[PDB]
Each structure stands twice: as C-alpha cells, then as structure tokens.
Amino acid sequence: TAQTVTGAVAAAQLGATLPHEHVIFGLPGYAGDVTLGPFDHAAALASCTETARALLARGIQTVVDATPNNCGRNPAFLREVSEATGLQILCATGFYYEGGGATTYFKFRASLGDAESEIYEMMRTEVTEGIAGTGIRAGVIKLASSRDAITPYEQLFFRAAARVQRETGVPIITHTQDGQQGPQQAELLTSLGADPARIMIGHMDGNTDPAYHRETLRHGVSIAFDRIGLQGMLGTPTDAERLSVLTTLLGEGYADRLLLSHDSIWHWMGRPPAIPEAALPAVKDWHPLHISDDILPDLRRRGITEEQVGQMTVGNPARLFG
Ligand SMILES: [Co+2]
Ligand SMILES: [Co+2]
C-alpha cells in the first residue's frame, strides 16, 4: 500500500498520479523573512484546495509532494488540503542538496559524530511512525545531489535512505541538479541494495542527450521528466526538447520506466515571488494542469498510444508508490 497524509491507500486506488509536485514550498531561509512574508493559512488553504479540485477534474487522484524537511514541509497542511478535496497526497522525508541552504546543521552533526544513523532514524521514524508527533507518515524518501558530484555530505542521506528502503520497501524519489548525476545516483542506490523498482531518479528532463537517460536506465531504475512546463529557466530545456527525448525513449520500449510531473509550487512560503518581465514565457506552463491539458494530448498526436500514456501516468506510479 501507499502511505498518504490521510492514511494507507491501495495501489489500484492511486489512479493517475503526478510523482513530483509541491503544495507548499519555501527555499531555505524563508522562515527568516517571516515579518514581511508571513504564512496566510486561510489564503494558502483556499488556493491549494482550488488547485487540488482542478486536478481531480482532470482525473488526477494522487499527488506525491516532494518537499524536503528543510524546504517548508508541512504534513498537517497537506492533510487539510487532502481532507477538504479528496485528493490523495503523499509527503516526503529527506533534506535538499548541499548548495541549497539549510545544510550546516547536519554537516555539523557529521563532523561531531555519526550523522548517517541520526538521518536514518529520522527517515525510519517519519516513514513508520510519523512526522513531528502528528501521526502523519511520509510515503516517499526524497534525496538530492549537487551538479558536479554526489558530495560526501549528500552520500550520508543516500546510505541512510537505502537502509530504510530495504527494511520498509518505501519509495525513493530524487532531485538531480542541472541535468547531471543521474547514472551516479542510480548506481549508488542499487549498489547499496535499494529496490530499483521503487526508485525514481528526478529532474531527468534537465538533460537533452538521450544517451545520459539510457545510462541511468541501465540500473533498472525509473526516471522522471518532472519539471515539465518550466522552460528555459536557469538551464532547464523547452517542453519541445523534453518531448523529443521522451518520444525517442518511448520508441525504445522504456514506457514502463518513464514518469511525468511539473515540480510546480502551488503556494510559496515567505514573500510571493517577483517574476521579471523576461521570465514570463519560462513559467507560463509551469502549473500542475499543464500535463493533463497540453502534454498528454500532444503525445497522443505524436503517435504515443493510450496504453503508453496510461503506463507512464497510472501503471508506473501504482508499481513505484503503491
Ligand atoms: Co528538485
Ligand atoms: Co521539487
């Protein structure tokens, strides 16, 4: 079964799923700007429930919230959004990448002792018992790595997650920075005994060379084209460049190991973002209704079958998360 914010749900009851989204997200440091950027709970609940109902209208019954522990994760809020709409939401356990802030606490616990075991115990408790004494369990483990290498600090989380995976069978979803480290993440996690059928290497759309994707897929892991809609923003490709690589892979029989999401943020923590005039086309399609409205119908038009679409959106997440 899949462990959601409302409880255990059967694999067959997940339906169409978006494997990587953020109901609420705050980049590390947001809590420090609480005076001018407070959290308006009522306005956040209103906006998030509206987006959730819009997703349910598209046939999307489940969303996997990939928000790391240090990036504004709020399991109680996700439960409110779920209970109000009926949309199934899975939350995460894990920390963001090293160059993403809020890294010093565990970097300090590491120089002073055994941080790997402390990280392991955090992930295990959050998966089996609950988060912050609420009883709401994490249904996935979120891992993240830097661009140039999976740093020694980041490897502490990878080894810790691999152990929780062997013991509980919990899914593992990841973040890759600037389209690099995908084969390395897959190699590391599989060598540590983590189930390749329960691993999803994320941000794989950040690379436009299909050889890189095949190199990651060699390890038997599933890969996610999860930043769909975010076009030409700080290194990210266009949706046309993403779909070109996806159709090459779909034509090579990889349908059973390919996933699709937007990595959208429904409500930002801290102050609302001031998006520049030049950056408007980049974030135009970066919302959670884009795949349902534009991508899947465009894939059907390209030659991708209803079976292949249903495999990526319903079949793969029932196996990976259920
Ligand atoms: Co990410
Ligand atoms: Co994300």
Tab-separated table of C-alpha atoms and ligand atoms in Angstrom:
chain	number	residue	atom	x	y	z
A	1	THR	CA	0.000	0.000	0.000
A	2	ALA	CA	0.896	3.695	-0.439
A	3	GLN	CA	1.221	5.783	2.705
A	4	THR	CA	-0.610	9.104	2.227
A	5	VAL	CA	-1.291	12.028	4.585
A	6	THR	CA	-4.795	10.605	5.252
A	7	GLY	CA	-3.529	7.022	5.660
A	8	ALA	CA	-2.795	3.791	3.764
A	9	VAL	CA	-4.302	3.558	0.254
A	10	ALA	CA	-4.257	0.558	-2.142
A	11	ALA	CA	-2.030	0.585	-5.269
A	12	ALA	CA	-5.085	0.236	-7.542
A	13	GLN	CA	-6.699	3.284	-5.876
A	14	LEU	CA	-3.891	5.762	-6.653
A	15	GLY	CA	-5.105	6.269	-10.231
A	16	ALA	CA	-3.425	8.972	-12.336
A	17	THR	CA	-0.594	10.493	-10.326
A	18	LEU	CA	1.804	13.441	-10.541
A	19	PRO	CA	5.018	11.950	-8.968
A	20	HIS	CA	6.742	15.256	-8.038
A	21	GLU	CA	4.868	18.455	-7.019
A	22	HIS	CA	4.909	20.918	-4.099
A	23	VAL	CA	1.632	22.049	-2.442
A	24	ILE	CA	3.743	24.487	-0.379
A	25	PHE	CA	7.471	25.238	-0.818
A	26	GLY	CA	9.901	27.656	0.714
A	27	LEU	CA	13.549	27.841	-0.251
A	28	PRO	CA	15.778	27.597	2.912
A	29	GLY	CA	15.815	30.958	4.688
A	30	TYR	CA	12.111	31.774	4.097
A	31	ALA	CA	11.386	31.446	7.849
A	32	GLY	CA	13.834	34.266	8.446
A	33	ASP	CA	11.662	36.637	6.374
A	34	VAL	CA	8.533	35.884	8.463
A	35	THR	CA	7.888	39.592	9.300
A	36	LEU	CA	7.247	40.782	5.721
A	37	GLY	CA	6.437	37.362	4.325
A	38	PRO	CA	4.091	35.625	6.824
A	39	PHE	CA	2.105	32.484	6.115
A	40	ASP	CA	-1.531	33.335	5.413
A	41	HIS	CA	-3.010	29.915	6.263
A	42	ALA	CA	-6.534	30.785	5.067
A	43	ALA	CA	-5.359	32.130	1.676
A	44	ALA	CA	-2.976	29.179	1.277
A	45	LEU	CA	-5.749	26.652	2.038
A	46	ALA	CA	-8.091	28.391	-0.433
A	47	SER	CA	-5.541	28.439	-3.269
A	48	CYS	CA	-4.296	24.863	-2.700
A	49	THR	CA	-7.804	23.338	-2.452
A	50	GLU	CA	-8.784	25.120	-5.701
A	51	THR	CA	-5.744	23.643	-7.496
A	52	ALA	CA	-6.499	20.206	-5.943
A	53	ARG	CA	-10.112	20.285	-7.230
A	54	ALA	CA	-8.834	21.341	-10.668
A	55	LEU	CA	-6.546	18.257	-10.663
A	56	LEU	CA	-9.414	15.941	-9.633
A	57	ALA	CA	-11.398	17.343	-12.583
A	58	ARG	CA	-8.573	16.190	-14.896
A	59	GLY	CA	-8.761	12.657	-13.473
A	60	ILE	CA	-5.617	13.057	-11.297
A	61	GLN	CA	-6.392	11.366	-7.975
A	62	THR	CA	-2.926	11.442	-6.406
A	63	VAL	CA	-0.047	13.886	-5.996
A	64	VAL	CA	3.334	12.994	-4.479
A	65	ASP	CA	4.552	16.067	-2.597
A	66	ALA	CA	8.339	16.001	-2.840
A	67	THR	CA	9.004	18.817	-0.351
A	68	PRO	CA	12.182	18.232	1.765
A	69	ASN	CA	12.152	18.672	5.575
A	70	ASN	CA	14.163	21.907	5.321
A	71	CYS	CA	12.122	23.374	2.441
A	72	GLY	CA	8.858	24.251	4.195
A	73	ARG	CA	7.359	20.763	4.551
A	74	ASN	CA	4.051	20.861	6.462
A	75	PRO	CA	2.347	17.395	6.674
A	76	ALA	CA	-0.602	18.822	8.661
A	77	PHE	CA	-1.372	21.349	5.912
A	78	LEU	CA	-1.178	18.628	3.207
A	79	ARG	CA	-3.689	16.635	5.285
A	80	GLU	CA	-6.066	19.636	5.364
A	81	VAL	CA	-5.887	20.039	1.556
A	82	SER	CA	-6.459	16.266	1.155
A	83	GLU	CA	-9.390	16.013	3.615
A	84	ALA	CA	-11.126	19.034	2.070
A	85	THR	CA	-10.957	17.816	-1.557
A	86	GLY	CA	-10.466	14.055	-1.585
A	87	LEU	CA	-7.148	14.333	-3.493
A	88	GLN	CA	-4.608	11.789	-2.214
A	89	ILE	CA	-1.275	13.350	-1.179
A	90	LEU	CA	1.975	11.536	-0.267
A	91	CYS	CA	4.598	13.570	1.588
A	92	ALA	CA	8.370	13.160	1.807
A	93	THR	CA	11.168	12.729	4.339
A	94	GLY	CA	14.661	13.946	3.493
A	95	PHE	CA	16.802	17.055	3.056
A	96	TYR	CA	17.628	19.175	-0.013
A	97	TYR	CA	21.038	19.323	-1.815
A	98	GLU	CA	24.218	20.860	-0.276
A	99	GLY	CA	24.225	24.041	-2.393
A	100	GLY	CA	20.579	24.589	-1.495
A	101	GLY	CA	20.981	26.027	2.002
A	102	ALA	CA	19.949	24.690	5.458
A	103	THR	CA	22.894	22.287	5.183
A	104	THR	CA	25.049	23.348	8.145
A	105	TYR	CA	23.039	21.562	10.929
A	106	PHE	CA	23.670	18.039	9.635
A	107	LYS	CA	27.144	18.990	8.307
A	108	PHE	CA	27.926	19.906	11.947
A	109	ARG	CA	26.342	16.710	13.408
A	110	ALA	CA	28.588	14.820	10.925
A	111	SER	CA	31.901	16.406	11.973
A	112	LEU	CA	30.916	15.776	15.612
A	113	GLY	CA	29.561	12.251	15.223
A	114	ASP	CA	27.516	9.620	13.419
A	115	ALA	CA	25.065	11.688	11.329
A	116	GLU	CA	24.205	8.795	8.982
A	117	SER	CA	22.468	6.950	11.857
A	118	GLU	CA	20.691	10.115	13.020
A	119	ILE	CA	19.452	10.712	9.430
A	120	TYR	CA	18.468	7.008	9.177
A	121	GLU	CA	16.500	7.175	12.450
A	122	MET	CA	14.742	10.372	11.254
A	123	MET	CA	13.707	8.774	7.933
A	124	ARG	CA	12.684	5.475	9.581
A	125	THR	CA	10.536	7.200	12.241
A	126	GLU	CA	8.913	9.535	9.686
A	127	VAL	CA	8.093	6.570	7.407
A	128	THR	CA	6.890	4.051	10.049
A	129	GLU	CA	5.574	6.134	12.990
A	130	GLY	CA	5.004	9.737	11.915
A	131	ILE	CA	6.284	13.285	11.432
A	132	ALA	CA	6.545	15.734	14.385
A	133	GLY	CA	4.262	13.651	16.627
A	134	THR	CA	1.262	14.137	14.307
A	135	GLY	CA	0.952	10.506	13.194
A	136	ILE	CA	1.184	11.566	9.544
A	137	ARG	CA	3.725	9.353	7.829
A	138	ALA	CA	5.964	10.041	4.849
A	139	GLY	CA	5.155	7.887	1.833
A	140	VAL	CA	8.418	8.555	-0.024
A	141	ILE	CA	12.034	9.388	0.773
A	142	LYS	CA	13.386	12.484	-1.012
A	143	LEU	CA	17.089	12.556	-1.920
A	144	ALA	CA	19.064	15.289	-3.634
A	145	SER	CA	22.542	15.661	-5.140
A	146	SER	CA	24.723	18.534	-6.424
A	147	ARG	CA	25.747	19.125	-10.072
A	148	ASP	CA	29.453	18.182	-10.048
A	149	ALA	CA	29.239	15.133	-7.725
A	150	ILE	CA	27.132	13.422	-5.059
A	151	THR	CA	29.142	15.086	-2.258
A	152	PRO	CA	30.267	13.217	0.951
A	153	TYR	CA	27.516	15.107	2.902
A	154	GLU	CA	24.823	14.088	0.403
A	155	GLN	CA	26.010	10.458	0.486
A	156	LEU	CA	25.043	10.248	4.176
A	157	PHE	CA	21.368	10.619	3.178
A	158	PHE	CA	21.728	8.144	0.278
A	159	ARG	CA	23.151	5.392	2.522
A	160	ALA	CA	20.551	6.157	5.213
A	161	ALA	CA	17.666	6.063	2.688
A	162	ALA	CA	18.916	2.833	1.106
A	163	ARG	CA	18.705	1.163	4.531
A	164	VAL	CA	15.149	2.425	5.259
A	165	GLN	CA	14.196	1.159	1.776
A	166	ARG	CA	15.494	-2.404	2.414
A	167	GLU	CA	13.575	-2.568	5.707
A	168	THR	CA	10.248	-0.943	4.749
A	169	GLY	CA	10.036	-1.090	0.947
A	170	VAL	CA	9.272	2.676	0.908
A	171	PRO	CA	9.687	4.531	-2.454
A	172	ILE	CA	12.686	6.774	-3.172
A	173	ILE	CA	12.347	9.899	-5.309
A	174	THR	CA	15.237	12.200	-6.120
A	175	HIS	CA	16.432	15.616	-7.322
A	176	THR	CA	19.282	15.988	-9.849
A	177	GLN	CA	20.969	19.373	-10.273
A	178	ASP	CA	21.462	20.857	-13.789
A	179	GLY	CA	20.879	17.554	-15.609
A	180	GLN	CA	23.840	15.775	-14.013
A	181	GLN	CA	24.463	12.860	-11.571
A	182	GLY	CA	21.553	10.643	-12.741
A	183	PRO	CA	23.622	7.471	-13.591
A	184	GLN	CA	25.681	8.021	-10.421
A	185	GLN	CA	22.571	8.235	-8.184
A	186	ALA	CA	21.146	5.087	-9.765
A	187	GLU	CA	24.495	3.239	-9.433
A	188	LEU	CA	24.957	4.252	-5.784
A	189	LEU	CA	21.400	3.380	-4.667
A	190	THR	CA	21.357	-0.011	-6.460
A	191	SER	CA	24.828	-0.999	-5.155
A	192	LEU	CA	23.543	-0.352	-1.618
A	193	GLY	CA	20.760	-2.897	-2.129
A	194	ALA	CA	17.849	-0.495	-2.720
A	195	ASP	CA	14.999	-1.887	-4.875
A	196	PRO	CA	15.361	-0.449	-8.467
A	197	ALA	CA	11.589	-0.868	-8.995
A	198	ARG	CA	10.981	1.581	-6.103
A	199	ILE	CA	13.465	4.280	-7.191
A	200	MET	CA	12.613	7.338	-9.292
A	201	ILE	CA	15.541	9.493	-10.407
A	202	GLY	CA	14.144	13.008	-10.800
A	203	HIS	CA	14.858	16.120	-12.897
A	204	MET	CA	15.969	13.816	-15.705
A	205	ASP	CA	14.429	16.247	-18.181
A	206	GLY	CA	17.261	18.651	-17.355
A	207	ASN	CA	19.460	16.814	-19.893
A	208	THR	CA	18.750	16.745	-23.657
A	209	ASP	CA	21.154	13.896	-24.616
A	210	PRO	CA	19.199	10.547	-24.617
A	211	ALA	CA	22.455	8.584	-24.018
A	212	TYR	CA	22.509	10.027	-20.468
A	213	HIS	CA	18.975	8.695	-19.851
A	214	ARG	CA	19.832	5.224	-21.204
A	215	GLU	CA	22.926	5.170	-18.937
A	216	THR	CA	20.648	5.815	-15.901
A	217	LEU	CA	18.024	3.312	-17.089
A	218	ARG	CA	20.718	0.580	-17.297
A	219	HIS	CA	20.489	0.279	-13.498
A	220	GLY	CA	16.795	-0.650	-13.714
A	221	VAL	CA	15.528	2.492	-12.029
A	222	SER	CA	12.610	4.609	-13.242
A	223	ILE	CA	13.234	8.165	-14.437
A	224	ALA	CA	11.054	11.265	-14.177
A	225	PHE	CA	10.669	14.103	-16.665
A	226	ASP	CA	9.420	16.112	-13.708
A	227	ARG	CA	9.959	19.833	-14.400
A	228	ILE	CA	7.600	19.920	-17.404
A	229	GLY	CA	6.375	23.445	-18.046
A	230	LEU	CA	9.455	25.185	-16.658
A	231	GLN	CA	11.006	26.255	-19.985
A	232	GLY	CA	14.418	27.938	-20.228
A	233	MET	CA	14.720	28.889	-16.563
A	234	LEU	CA	18.314	28.713	-15.236
A	235	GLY	CA	19.389	25.870	-17.543
A	236	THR	CA	16.122	23.922	-17.969
A	237	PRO	CA	15.181	22.901	-21.560
A	238	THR	CA	11.999	23.673	-23.526
A	239	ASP	CA	8.983	21.319	-23.445
A	240	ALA	CA	9.668	20.584	-27.142
A	241	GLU	CA	13.234	19.465	-26.279
A	242	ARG	CA	11.811	17.313	-23.439
A	243	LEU	CA	9.199	15.622	-25.646
A	244	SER	CA	11.818	14.920	-28.345
A	245	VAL	CA	13.903	12.927	-25.816
A	246	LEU	CA	10.773	11.287	-24.335
A	247	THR	CA	9.492	10.019	-27.726
A	248	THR	CA	12.959	8.563	-28.529
A	249	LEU	CA	12.836	6.632	-25.217
A	250	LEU	CA	9.162	5.628	-25.643
A	251	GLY	CA	10.083	4.272	-29.088
A	252	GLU	CA	12.786	2.162	-27.416
A	253	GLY	CA	10.291	0.447	-25.081
A	254	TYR	CA	11.067	2.443	-21.916
A	255	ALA	CA	7.365	3.327	-21.248
A	256	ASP	CA	7.305	1.199	-18.079
A	257	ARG	CA	10.146	3.218	-16.526
A	258	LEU	CA	9.223	6.814	-17.569
A	259	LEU	CA	7.276	9.238	-15.291
A	260	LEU	CA	5.844	12.773	-15.789
A	261	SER	CA	5.348	15.741	-13.397
A	262	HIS	CA	5.744	19.566	-13.230
A	263	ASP	CA	7.693	20.277	-9.984
A	264	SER	CA	5.150	23.101	-9.521
A	265	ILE	CA	4.725	25.179	-6.384
A	266	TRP	CA	1.061	25.932	-5.588
A	267	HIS	CA	1.810	28.311	-2.696
A	268	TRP	CA	5.196	29.843	-1.936
A	269	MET	CA	6.396	30.223	1.643
A	270	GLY	CA	7.874	33.599	2.588
A	271	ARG	CA	7.230	36.546	0.264
A	272	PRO	CA	5.386	35.910	-3.058
A	273	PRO	CA	7.906	35.794	-5.995
A	274	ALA	CA	8.580	38.839	-8.124
A	275	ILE	CA	8.912	37.216	-11.558
A	276	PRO	CA	10.750	39.542	-14.083
A	277	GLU	CA	9.185	40.549	-17.428
A	278	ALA	CA	11.699	38.468	-19.442
A	279	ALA	CA	10.941	35.338	-17.370
A	280	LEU	CA	7.174	35.211	-18.129
A	281	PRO	CA	7.260	32.683	-21.053
A	282	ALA	CA	9.529	30.446	-18.931
A	283	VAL	CA	6.978	29.968	-16.121
A	284	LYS	CA	3.790	30.245	-18.261
A	285	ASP	CA	3.170	26.500	-18.490
A	286	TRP	CA	4.660	25.759	-15.027
A	287	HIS	CA	1.439	24.826	-13.222
A	288	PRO	CA	0.007	21.379	-12.320
A	289	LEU	CA	-2.715	21.307	-15.024
A	290	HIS	CA	-0.255	21.544	-17.948
A	291	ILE	CA	0.377	17.797	-18.440
A	292	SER	CA	-3.311	16.941	-18.482
A	293	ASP	CA	-4.243	19.824	-20.811
A	294	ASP	CA	-1.250	20.116	-23.135
A	295	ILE	CA	1.341	17.301	-22.806
A	296	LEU	CA	-0.675	14.027	-22.861
A	297	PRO	CA	-2.853	15.215	-25.825
A	298	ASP	CA	0.314	16.344	-27.687
A	299	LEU	CA	1.894	12.899	-27.037
A	300	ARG	CA	-1.244	11.195	-28.419
A	301	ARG	CA	-0.921	13.419	-31.515
A	302	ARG	CA	2.762	12.399	-31.912
A	303	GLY	CA	1.979	8.676	-32.090
A	304	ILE	CA	2.179	7.645	-28.417
A	305	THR	CA	-0.619	5.170	-27.612
A	306	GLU	CA	-3.298	5.418	-24.892
A	307	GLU	CA	-1.662	2.336	-23.336
A	308	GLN	CA	1.780	4.039	-23.175
A	309	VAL	CA	0.206	7.193	-21.662
A	310	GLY	CA	-1.689	5.091	-19.125
A	311	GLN	CA	1.550	3.220	-18.308
A	312	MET	CA	3.542	6.397	-17.521
A	313	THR	CA	0.721	8.107	-15.580
A	314	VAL	CA	-1.199	5.229	-13.916
A	315	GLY	CA	0.815	1.983	-14.314
A	316	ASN	CA	4.258	3.233	-13.234
A	317	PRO	CA	3.119	5.092	-10.101
A	318	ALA	CA	0.926	2.165	-8.901
A	319	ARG	CA	4.080	-0.012	-9.007
A	320	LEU	CA	6.536	2.620	-7.695
A	321	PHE	CA	4.399	4.182	-4.920
A	322	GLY	CA	1.718	1.617	-4.136
B	1	CO	CO	14.318	19.374	-7.062
B	2	CO	CO	10.810	19.588	-6.305
